[PDB]
Structure 1
Amino acid sequence: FRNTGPVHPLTRQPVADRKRFGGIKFGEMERDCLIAHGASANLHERLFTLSDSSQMHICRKCKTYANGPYCRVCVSSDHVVRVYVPYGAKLLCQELFSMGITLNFDTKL
């Protein structure tokens, strides 16, 4: 059983060790079954809320990723929006940038 515990160094997910308050893997089959049932709030909570939760800052003017937030590609702008995406998405973006692929994000708000 687990309520709160340490996270993995690579991804911000509960450790698999049982003695260290490990969590239960939410597999693909369970996600498919929950989609078939039609419950999205439970699926959203299990994949984003109780799972690795992080934040990413995207510049409104230029479609780039900015690290308050500040984008060096453009000038210091006061229009920067924050999106709520899992830490796995940020890890994938970092991996894509390392391999030589740049992603552009067009926020709707």
Structure 2
Amino acid sequence: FRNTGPVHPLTRQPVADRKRFGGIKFGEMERDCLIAHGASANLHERLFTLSDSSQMHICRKCKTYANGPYCRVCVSSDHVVRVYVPYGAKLLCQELFSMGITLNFDTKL
């Protein structure tokens, strides 16, 4: 069982050690069954809220990722939005930039 516990170093997800607080994997089959049932709030909570939850900042003038956030592509911009995405998305973005792929994000708000 688990309520709150240590997270894995690479990805901020619960560890798989029963002696520690551990965690239960929410696999692909469970996600497919939940989609078939149509429960979206449970699926959002299990994949984002109770799972690895992080935040990302994107410049809106130029489709770039800004690290308060500051965009070095342009001058200091007062119009920067924050998106709530799982930490896995940020890890994938970092991996894509490492391999040589630049991602452009066009936020809707």
TM-score bracket, normalised by the shorter chain, equals over 0.9
How far has the Cα of 1:106 moved from its partner?
0.1
**CA deviations over 1:27-82 (Å, ceiling 9, x no partner):** 00000000000000000000000000000000010100000000101110100000
SS in 1 for 2:88: helix
TM normalised by structure 1 equals 0.99
**CA deviations over 1:83-108 (Å, ceiling 9, x no partner):** 00000000000000000000000000
- Identity percentage of aligned residues: 100
| Aligned length, in residue pairs | 109
How far has the Cα of 1:21 moved from its partner?
0.5
1:95-106 matched pairs, under 5 angstroms: 95-106=95-106
Segments of 5+ residues of structure 1 without an aligned counterpart are: none
TM normalised by structure 2 equals 0.99
Greater share of strand? 2
Taking only aligned residues, the RMSD between alpha carbons, in angstroms, comes to 0.3
Segments of 5+ residues of structure 2 without an aligned counterpart are: none
1:71-82 matched pairs, under 5 angstroms: 71-82=71-82
